[PDB]
Design a protein around this ligand. Structure first.
Ligand SMILES: CC(C)(c1ccc(O)cc1)c1ccc(O)cc1
Ligand code: NA
Length: 222
């Protein structure tokens, strides 16, 4: 499938978390580091989305609405995929892999465990990079924003991305005629974990103890 191959080459380069070596470890350092990483990823995600067929033709508003509703799912799918060959560890970046203890002192035990639940299921399904990038695009198009202007156009985008997944699976996984649907059935857990993550960091935002940059702040306040 061409769309899949296109998404593959449009995949952005890895990013480093770069936790400050002079700062003492604490929940504030972890959260600050993670949100800092996320801010930089959002910049790249925005650029990445321009490569998705038909995305740049939507109105700026609709493009923004889709992103404001899907940003967390995209960010989470990323750490999920990066962590597939690991055990009980989340690879936020090559230089930032969180084990159970780290999640604990960062107050992210329940959230990271949900992310690990996502990882568990994808490991069992043997999620391929081709499927990961297509799911990321589908997640963006199917984000369910409450403010979409051109419903049909967004539906059209969802349809083209779904067709790519179906096409890919029909030609690459003939042994399982229902693999495309299984992939789609993983989206609910992604959506569920993201809704909680957004609520969690929104609260962290209110507490005011963790500095956050412009873009991250913009998505979170959406
Ligand atoms: C949004 C968040 C700061 C993040 C940062 C970077 C990333 O690649 C993916 C997600 C995050 C959400 C939930 C979570 O449990 C840990 C980190
Ligand atoms: Na979605």
């Amino acid at each position: 499938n061409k769309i899949v191959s296109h998404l593959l080459v449009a995949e952005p380069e890895k990013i480093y978390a770069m936790p400050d070596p002079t700062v003492p470890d604490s929940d504030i350092k972890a959260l600050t580091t993670l949100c800092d990483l996320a801010d930089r990823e959002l910049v790249v995600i925005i650029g990445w989305a321009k490569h998705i067929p038909g995305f740049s033709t939507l109105s700026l508003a609709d493009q923004m609405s889709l992103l404001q509703s899907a940003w967390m799912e995209i960010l989470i799918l990323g750490v999920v995929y990066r962590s597939l060959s690991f055990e009980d560890e989340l690879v936020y970046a090559d230089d930032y892999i969180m084990d159970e203890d780290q999640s604990k002192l960062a107050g992210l035990l329940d959230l990271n465990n949900a992310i690990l639940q996502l990882v568990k299921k994808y490991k069992s399904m043997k999620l391929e990079k081709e499927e990961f990038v297509t799911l990321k695009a589908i997640a963006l198009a199917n984000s369910d924003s409450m403010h979409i202007e051109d419903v049909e156009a967004v539906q059209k985008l969802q349809d083209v991305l779904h067709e790519a997944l179906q096409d890919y699976e029909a030609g690459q996984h003939m042994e399982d005629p229902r693999r495309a649907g299984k992939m789609l059935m993983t989206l609910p857990l992604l959506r569920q974990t993201s809704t909680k993550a957004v609520q969690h960091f929104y609260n962290i935002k209110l507490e005011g103890k963790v500095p956050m940059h412009k873009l991250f702040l913009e998505m979170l306040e959406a």
